[PDB]
Amino acid sequence: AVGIGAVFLGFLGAAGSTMGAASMTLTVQARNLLSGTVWGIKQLQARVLAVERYLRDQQLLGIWGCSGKLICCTNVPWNSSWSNRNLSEIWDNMTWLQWDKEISNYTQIIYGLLEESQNQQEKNEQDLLALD
Amino acid sequence: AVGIGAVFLGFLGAAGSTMGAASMTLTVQARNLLSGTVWGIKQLQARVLAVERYLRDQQLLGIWGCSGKLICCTNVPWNSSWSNRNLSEIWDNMTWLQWDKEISNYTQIIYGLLEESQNQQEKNEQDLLALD
Amino acid sequence: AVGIGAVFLGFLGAAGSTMGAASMTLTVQARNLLSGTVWGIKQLQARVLAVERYLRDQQLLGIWGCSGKLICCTNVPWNSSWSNRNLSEIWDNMTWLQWDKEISNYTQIIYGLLEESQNQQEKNEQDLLALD
Amino acid sequence: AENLWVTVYYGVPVWKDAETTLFCASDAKAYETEKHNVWATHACVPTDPNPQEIHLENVTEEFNMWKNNMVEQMHTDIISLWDQSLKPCVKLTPLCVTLQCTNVTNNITDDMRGELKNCSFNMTTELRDKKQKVYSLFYRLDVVQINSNKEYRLINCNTSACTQACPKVSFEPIPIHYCAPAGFAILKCKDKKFNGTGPCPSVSTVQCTHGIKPVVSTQLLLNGSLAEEEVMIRSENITNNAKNILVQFNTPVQINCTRPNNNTRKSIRIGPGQAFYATGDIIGDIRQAHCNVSKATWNETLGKVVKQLRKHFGNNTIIRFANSSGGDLEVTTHSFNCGGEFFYCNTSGLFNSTWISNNDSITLPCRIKQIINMWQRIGQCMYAPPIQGVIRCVSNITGLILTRDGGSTNSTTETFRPGGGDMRDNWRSELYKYKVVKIEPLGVAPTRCKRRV
Amino acid sequence: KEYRLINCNTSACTQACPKVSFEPIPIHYCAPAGFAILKCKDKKFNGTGPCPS
Amino acid sequence: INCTRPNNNTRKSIRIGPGQAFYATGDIIGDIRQAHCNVSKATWNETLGKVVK
Amino acid sequence: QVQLVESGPGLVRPSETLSLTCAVSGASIRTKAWWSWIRQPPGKGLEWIGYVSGGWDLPNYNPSLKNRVIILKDTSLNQFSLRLTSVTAADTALYYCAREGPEDFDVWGPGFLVTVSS
Amino acid sequence: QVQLVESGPGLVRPSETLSLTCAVSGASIRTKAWWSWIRQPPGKGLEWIGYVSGGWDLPNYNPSLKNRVIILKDTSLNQFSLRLTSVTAADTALYYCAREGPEDFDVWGPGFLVTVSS
Numbered sequence A, B, C: 001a002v003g004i005g006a007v008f009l010g011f012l013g014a015a016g017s018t019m020g021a022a023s024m025t026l027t028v029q030a031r032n033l034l035s036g037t038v039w040g041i042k043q044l045q046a047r048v049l050a051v052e053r054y055l056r057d058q059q060l061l062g063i064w065g066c067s068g069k070l071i072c073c074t075n076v077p078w079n080s081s082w083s084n085r086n087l088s089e090i091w092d093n094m095t096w097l098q099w100d101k102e103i104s105n106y107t108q109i110i111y112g113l114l115e116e117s118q119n120q121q122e123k124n125e126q127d128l129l130a131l132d
Numbered sequence D: 001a002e003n004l005w006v007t008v009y010y011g012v013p014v015w016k017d018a019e020t021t022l023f024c025a026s027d028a029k030a031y032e033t034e035k036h037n038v039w040a041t042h043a044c045v046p047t048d049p050n051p052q053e054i055h056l057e058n059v060t061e062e063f064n065m066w067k068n069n070m071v072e073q074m075h076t077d078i079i080s081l082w083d084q085s086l087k088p089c090v091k092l093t094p095l096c097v098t099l100q101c102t103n104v105t106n107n108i109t110d111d112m113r114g115e116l117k118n119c120s121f122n123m124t125t126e127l128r129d130k131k132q133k134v135y136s137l138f139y140r141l142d143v144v145q146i147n148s149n150k151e152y153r154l155i156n157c158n159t160s161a162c163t164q165a166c167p168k169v170s171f172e173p174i175p176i177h178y179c180a181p182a183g184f185a186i187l188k189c190k191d192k193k194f195n196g197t198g199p200c201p202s203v204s205t206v207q208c209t210h211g212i213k214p215v216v217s218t219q220l221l222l223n224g225s226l227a228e229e230e231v232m233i234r235s236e237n238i239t240n241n242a243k244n245i246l247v248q249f250n251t252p253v254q255i256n257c258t259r260p261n262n263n264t265r266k267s268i269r270i271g272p273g274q275a276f277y278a279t280g281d282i283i284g285d286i287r288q289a290h291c292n293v294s295k296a297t298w299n300e301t302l303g304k305v306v307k308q309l310r311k312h313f314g315n316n317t318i319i320r321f322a323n324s325s326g327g328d329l330e331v332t333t334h335s336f337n338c339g340g341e342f343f344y345c346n347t348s349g350l351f352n353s354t355w356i357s358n359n360d361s362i363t364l365p366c367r368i369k370q371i372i373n374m375w376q377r378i379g380q381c382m383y384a385p386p387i388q389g390v391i392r393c394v395s396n397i398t399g400l401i402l403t404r405d406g407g408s409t410n411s412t413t414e415t416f417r418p419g420g421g422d423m424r425d426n427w428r429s430e431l432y433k434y435k436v437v438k439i440e441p442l443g444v445a446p447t448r449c450k451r452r453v
Numbered sequence E: 001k002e003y004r005l006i007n008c009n010t011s012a013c014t015q016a017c018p019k020v021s022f023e024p025i026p027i028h029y030c031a032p033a034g035f036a037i038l039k040c041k042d043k044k045f046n047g048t049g050p051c052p053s
Numbered sequence F: 001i002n003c004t005r006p007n008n009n010t011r012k013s014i015r016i017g018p019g020q021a022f023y024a025t026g027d028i029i030g031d032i033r034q035a036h037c038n039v040s041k042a043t044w045n046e047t048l049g050k051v052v053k
Numbered sequence G, H: 001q002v003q004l005v006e007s008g009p010g011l012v013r014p015s016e017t018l019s020l021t022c023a024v025s026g027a028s029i030r031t032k033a034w035w036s037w038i039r040q041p042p043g044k045g046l047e048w049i050g051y052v053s054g055g056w057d058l059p060n061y062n063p064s065l066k067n068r069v070i071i072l073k074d075t076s077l078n079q080f081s082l083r084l085t086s087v088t089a090a091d092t093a094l095y096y097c098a099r100e101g102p103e104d105f106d107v108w109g110p111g112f113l114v115t116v117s118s
């Protein structure tokens, strides 16, 4: 549309596009997650719920391979039973909503695999810096 | 003065000195930014405003090249129209207050340049780890 | 016990074992530190005290060599007067409680040494990237 | 290798003793009842069912129930909650008025005085111009003779105003689970034999405590957690006598308590939307409230606590019991709140025994105050609404609170008297297991690795 | 012939302050951080179902 | 500066209602005088000279 | 005082996805414990299928089960479920949910015969 | 219903810093839109100068404008400003503020002739 050619606009703008196109615009959805006599309690619990959710996400990232890299290749493989589709098809064919509907079952095992991979990389790096 | 020779003292102590001298003492101004029946609402909104400002600064850093390196060389160049002064003169001649008065206009374009540089480095690293 | 062989169970489970065995299980004690009309003030001050303590610990790490690496080799040496025990004995012989009782005196000098080491590494890296 | 470097380990399991705030938790079954007919399931988070009671092994922590925290916080929380459940309810300022009282219509002997006095008095209606004459019943312990004729007043009407309790909110205890917030953990000493102080060799961490129902009782603490096998006495110092002795016994003793006087409540309109609940007719016989106990089980449990108390005082020691030496009312008797009405029941029948080193039922009479001043504040009294029907309750007596007399001058016998004292000794009977610790991550340790540039 | 007010046997009454007026000022509702408000901008839309725009 | 009320007062508790205490003034024990303040003449003249200067 | 009760089929066709679910009462799931599945072919010895943990352990199975077994815990319902994709008629066995603790498998389930037949 | 109105000079000397400012009403600035500047020399065709975005796009201009054009948005005043340093008399043109949307430049400004003359 207006943002054709130079593919960007405001946040949640790429949510209709395919995930390959949406992958280039991730900084703003990360950005619009933190900033934004009894009603002060409502304002305060909203603000601390926002920073608690943001800190939980940053801690989930920090125990994995990437602290703030925002795109992280890692060392766990991929079971092809989970996706069971053509690989380059999903980046020109699927939205992130439809992809999250696809792997709704295959969740929470990936995160433990990430933690095992990161702890294994940490003990391997500890051994490598130990014998040197 | 007392801190002559070994150039350090408490926080905001380097604020009068030049920016080259003040650059060696940055850990404490970073440190004294987080720690420190209706008045509890004032205390709480002060504390959550402090942690919201600190998290906004850490997120502004984290989307750039450095998560917590506290000194970050990066890949964006410098328009010499902005500074338009002798380079080694400003580290022996200017305070940080005077420098912030100098580049008050030339702000908020630097940050988008940093984000473009970091996203370009991320897609280049993704391609580099992809073809390998 | 139940977690014999594959040495893991829930948080504070390794607190009785030796520190060498407990070193492989650190992600959950890091995990169970953040998540978990006048009583809302108590709930809110508990939540913001929790996130303030977690942010102070993450800032204490971030000014050192490791942002979120969770195991950090570093460049400061070790005074053998502090530990004054056999090195491989303590990882099969001591609990973390007993070790923290041992080095209770020898604290808060280590942290300044870490800050000096990190700032020295930063100025050395600045010089190295400057002359190149 | 001898060039040792240092390493920071974040998330090290190690704690310290600390004193922080806590976390309310109530079960969702009490949340199922609408509009909070008990206090504060809205001011208290719903309990996540079956939480993590993860064991800890080869760990020795020193517990101390006497200098323990969180019992002070439980006392402060219950006091502030009791205050916060009265501000909606009606103040009884216009009730302080000249009462024309006579005895209740009853064939009373001149010896035994009538416990219930009928009282008629002026009362404002909803309309300010018109006042009405209305009658009610009160107890002897709520009226005094201001000064031919015989005219009374209420007892509280020259120290404080009184707040009538709302008949919506009931005082029956729902179990409170205490939980630690983030960055803190509750260590439960799971030792079978444990006298409250010292190293507990078998502990276990937890996030939330067990169900602690807040009961209000002075002597003979009710419905508490009973011990596993033995009968455990606990004191801060047994040789000291100023400290109480918390006796927790194994088999709970069944107690039956009743007021048999059938009552009819009566709504009197104080003003616009102001309802006062007085006592109307005594439908039936005029009897006396009483609390039973089983004779054989009480004698057996007294034998058990004698057998356990002879450990700390030598074998050849005579142990006898006595009743309370005196003071205010609610430390002489044992007091509680059955069905939303308060009992003050005499305990001389339970503590007249002596013990040498070698199908019936005890009844004991109670008294019923309608007003109460619990925690002994300066300016608060709670009036309690009279409830319909003959009222009975069954409870499990769990422990006693005893006190040794200050024995000197070379006596073999050492007598024990039940003393209520502070309410905190109730909660110290249920918080001896738990303590709160602060987790401290980022330990530091030498090893052989150097960070490469 | 003597009367009373209608509310005087169910509740007390609070007289409204003549300062505060009951005329509506427009309220905008906003989401906090981490939430967004989706507005269905469809012309023909009967309140329930998929909104294509 | 020295300031005093020299009228000696006796407070008196009057019970307004249940637990309502009001503190009235009872007897004036002694002379009926006027409350007053004092300042040193020379120091005040000196400080007025300072502020004039 | 812990009580484990299995639920699910006992008669399934081969080459299908088998799944049981064991309910747990008397204690909590998130304890120092491995909520485990152990089977037994009829007339023969036991066969340990695998476990899951109430902490954060990754579940570890017997490698003879050919990576067709996914035990999934349900802490919001105090349950934990066995899975077995692509079953055969030789996989007819009594199935057991149990709890490894500081003692070895104290409270079992009653154990139900899943007879895989076509 | 959007309304864009330019403001600024129409007569400036060459070799100076030119700057206009277009006010926006009828809608919001931070929309799916490129608030743009487009010029037209008199008697000739259009000449697209550049844009800025109400999101977080970096502004992208025509490279023929020789990096002398800085369009700066003012979201607190619902405006966006053109700049043109070191102008010449051949840069005399009607200037237009406009809004690229899902349709192509629906609401323009009226367009004012900046006649650069010495």
Ligand SMILES: *[C@@H]1O[C@H](CO)[C@@H](O[C@@H]2O[C@H](CO)[C@@H](O[C@@H]3O[C@H](CO[C@H]4O[C@H](CO)[C@@H](O)[C@H](O)[C@@H]4O)[C@@H](O)[C@H](O[C@H]4O[C@H](CO)[C@@H](O)[C@H](O)[C@@H]4O)[C@@H]3O)[C@H](O)[C@H]2NC(C)=O)[C@H](O)[C@H]1NC(C)=O
Pocket (backbone or CB within 6 Å): D111, D346, D347, D348, D349
């Ligand atoms: C908790 O529960 C205990 C157990 O019952 C109560 O203890 C009893 O208390 C009463 C009085 O408080 C004790 O007193 C007894 O009163 C009886 C009635 O008094 C009339 O008769 C006497 C003459 O005997 C007159 O002077 C008086 O004015 C009344 O007209 C007496 O009959 C009792 O006498 C007993 O002892 C004498 C000894 O010579 C015998 O001859 C009598 O036959 C009789 O047995 C006595 O004076 C009573 O003793 C207490 N019970 C016991 C078992 O000791 C507590 O009072 C209660 N707590 C509270 C706060 O009330």
Ligand SMILES: *[C@@H]1O[C@H](CO)[C@@H](O[C@@H]2O[C@H](CO)[C@@H](O[C@@H]3O[C@H](CO)[C@@H](O)[C@H](O)[C@@H]3O)[C@H](O)[C@H]2NC(C)=O)[C@H](O)[C@H]1NC(C)=O
Pocket (backbone or CB within 6 Å): D099, D100, D120, D121, D122, D133
């Ligand atoms: C309820 O309110 C009524 C109305 O005021 C009270 O009745 C009045 O009480 C006074 C005080 O006793 C009476 O004054 C005395 O009356 C006697 C008998 O007539 C007389 O001998 C004395 O000299 C003096 O006047 C007054 O008459 C009486 N009025 C009525 C209509 O009964 C009443 O006391 C209040 N309380 C109760 C419990 O009813």
Ligand SMILES: *[C@@H]1O[C@H](CO)[C@@H](O[C@@H]2O[C@H](CO)[C@@H](O[C@@H]3O[C@H](CO)[C@@H](O)[C@H](O)[C@@H]3O)[C@H](O)[C@H]2NC(C)=O)[C@H](O)[C@H]1NC(C)=O
Pocket (backbone or CB within 6 Å): D323, D324, D325, D326, D332, D333, D346, D348
């Ligand atoms: C604990 O038990 C003892 C008895 O073992 C109680 O002592 C008894 O106390 C009552 C009153 O407290 C005495 O009653 C007297 O009755 C006459 C009758 O009118 C009265 O005039 C007296 O003033 C007194 O009230 C009784 O005599 C006394 N018993 C003995 C043997 O002296 C004691 O009260 C009990 N304590 C509690 C708290 O129950």
Ligand SMILES: *[C@@H]1O[C@H](CO)[C@@H](O[C@@H]2O[C@H](CO)[C@@H](O[C@@H]3O[C@H](CO)[C@@H](O)[C@H](O)[C@@H]3O)[C@H](O)[C@H]2NC(C)=O)[C@H](O)[C@H]1NC(C)=O
Pocket (backbone or CB within 6 Å): D348, D349, D352, D353
């Ligand atoms: C103290 O404990 C016992 C409960 O086992 C009770 O002692 C009882 O005291 C009364 C006093 O009148 C005794 O009644 C009379 O005693 C004489 C002997 O002095 C006897 O000859 C009469 O036939 C009559 O029974 C009663 O016997 C006695 N009980 C026993 C088992 O000896 C008393 O209730 C307790 N004290 C208090 C204050 O509750």
Ligand SMILES: *[C@@H]1O[C@H](CO)[C@@H](O[C@@H]2O[C@H](CO)[C@@H](O)[C@H](O)[C@H]2NC(C)=O)[C@H](O)[C@H]1NC(C)=O
Pocket (backbone or CB within 6 Å): D254, D255, D256, D292, D293, D294, D361, D394
């Ligand atoms: C207290 O009251 C309860 C009322 O339920 C009594 O319990 C009953 O007692 C009778 C008599 O032995 C038995 O036949 C019933 O089976 C009991 N029912 C229950 C539910 O327990 C109890 O015995 C009374 N206790 C005392 C000491 O009086």
Ligand SMILES: *[C@@H]1O[C@H](CO)[C@@H](O[C@@H]2O[C@H](CO)[C@@H](O)[C@H](O)[C@H]2NC(C)=O)[C@H](O)[C@H]1NC(C)=O
Pocket (backbone or CB within 6 Å): F001, F002, F038, F039, F040
């Ligand atoms: C105000 O009152 C104070 C009362 O202490 C006076 O201070 C005393 O003055 C006398 C008289 O010169 C001295 O002997 C004392 O030594 C003073 N005592 C102290 C503690 O200062 C003071 O002079 C009075 N001032 C005026 C202006 O009246």
Ligand SMILES: *[C@@H]1O[C@H](CO)[C@@H](O)[C@H](O)[C@H]1NC(C)=O
Pocket (backbone or CB within 6 Å): A101, A102, A105
């Ligand atoms: C996810 O699992 C459910 C069973 O809980 C199943 O019905 C559903 O088909 C699965 N989703 C997909 C995409 O297969």
Ligand SMILES: *[C@@H]1O[C@H](CO)[C@@H](O)[C@H](O)[C@H]1NC(C)=O
Pocket (backbone or CB within 6 Å): B101, B102, B105
């Ligand atoms: C910054 O911009 C303003 C115009 O908004 C200008 O007046 C000022 O001179 C500029 N600052 C410097 C240092 O040139």
Ligand SMILES: *[C@@H]1O[C@H](CO)[C@@H](O)[C@H](O)[C@H]1NC(C)=O
Pocket (backbone or CB within 6 Å): C101, C102, C105
């Ligand atoms: C720590 O220092 C104290 C003096 O403050 C000393 O008494 C103690 O022995 C020291 N600890 C050890 C383990 O030596």
Ligand SMILES: *[C@@H]1O[C@H](CO)[C@@H](O)[C@H](O)[C@H]1NC(C)=O
Pocket (backbone or CB within 6 Å): D299, D300, D353
């Ligand atoms: C308790 O029971 C024993 C055994 O029958 C008996 O000897 C003793 O006297 C009893 N105690 C009382 C106070 O009756």
Ligand SMILES: *[C@@H]1O[C@H](CO)[C@@H](O)[C@H](O)[C@H]1NC(C)=O
Pocket (backbone or CB within 6 Å): F045, F046
């Ligand atoms: C203040 O003191 C000076 C010096 O004695 C004198 O001349 C002057 O009159 C005094 N002021 C007053 C107001 O008396």
